[PDB]
Amino acid sequence: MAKVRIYQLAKELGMETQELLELLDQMGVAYKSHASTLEEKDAEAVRELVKEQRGLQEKLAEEERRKSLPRRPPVVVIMGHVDHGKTTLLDYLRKSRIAEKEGGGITQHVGAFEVKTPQGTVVFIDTPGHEAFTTIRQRGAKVADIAVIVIAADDGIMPQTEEAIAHAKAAGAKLIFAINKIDLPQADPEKVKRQLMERGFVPEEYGGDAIVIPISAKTGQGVQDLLEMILLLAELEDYRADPNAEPRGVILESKLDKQAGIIANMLVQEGTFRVGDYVVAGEAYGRIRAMMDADGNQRKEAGPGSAVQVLGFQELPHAGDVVEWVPDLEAAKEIAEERKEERKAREEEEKARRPRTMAELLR
């Protein structure tokens, strides 16, 4: 403290000689060499300035950390004609998880499952519908990043295929075309490619931008390439999300468990939902009483990419509705109620203008 030579003070503070001499120059403190003695007031001033500077270096480095959001896994939906193999592929992927069971392990159906891979994890949506609207249409907060369109090599592109493609494009998904059943004798992948090109999807093979991957969902051939391609796209699109943002997710589906009551499966997209949070999804609200993930584990928290079954909604939420964190029960009720009475007011819109004329009837 008093009196200290500059070399002593440098040792004390873990600074290089020239580094401390540079600081003394900044402060206008004079010295002959690092062997000079500092007045106590100067040394104290040094110790304080160094403390401050080191703290701001740290604060400045910690804020540069807090703006690189962590990666989140790609979310994938598998689509196409019901007989072309999307179901066989989804089943293959779901099985590929367990790898000679556990056992048990257990498993729970929460609307999506994860496929873990040396290159990363992929989330596959696994729900019986598409979302809502017509059959099988979607609105539809965006759920999936990538849509794998599974087309049978024998049958080729059909109307369910075209519907799947239009839905995926409408939802903003990146498309991967998976040409399935390639082992069949009547397999005609080249015809499917021509059909893709007729529709404006030119395969990369021919210098276009459409991603086309041959697979066999029955045997698993090509499925690994499909996963690697999903994960490559994820790295290039660079999907990220803030686990500390206000929680936001999307309802995948909801139902009544006779014992537990209203359950809803939701995919988390931003922030981290926690047991005890209030949420609103459309006109439905509740306190999150419990969350269970696909491995059957009770979760206190669910961050980006997690699919969980949530207990606590007081009415069935709709598929495709955004789940939003709110600060308390009062806010949950106000938001839900304002949406209800607004829908009810635009319903009186069509109970008035324009239902048009009435009844040209029997008998």
Author numbering: 1 to 363
The authors write:
Translation initiation factor 2 (IF2) is involved in the early steps of bacterial protein synthesis. IF2 is also responsible for the fast subunit association and 70S IC formation, an event that is directly coupled to the activation of the IF2 GTPase. Here, we present the crystal structure of the eubacterial IF2 core as the individual apoprotein and in GTP-bound and GDP-bound forms.
The structure of the apoprotein was determined by multi-wavelength anomalous dispersion (MAD) phasing using selenomethionine and was refined to 1.95 Å resolution. The G domain contains two rather flexible loops (switch I and II; residues 97–103 and 130–139, respectively) which adopt different conformations in the apo, GTP-bound and GDP-bound states. The switch I conformation varies significantly between the apo and nucleotide-bound states, probably owing to the presence of two glycines (RIAEK­EAGG sequence) which are highly conserved and provide flexibility (as also illustrated by higher B factors). In the apo state the side chain of His130 is not visible in the map, indicating that its role is nucleotide-dependent.
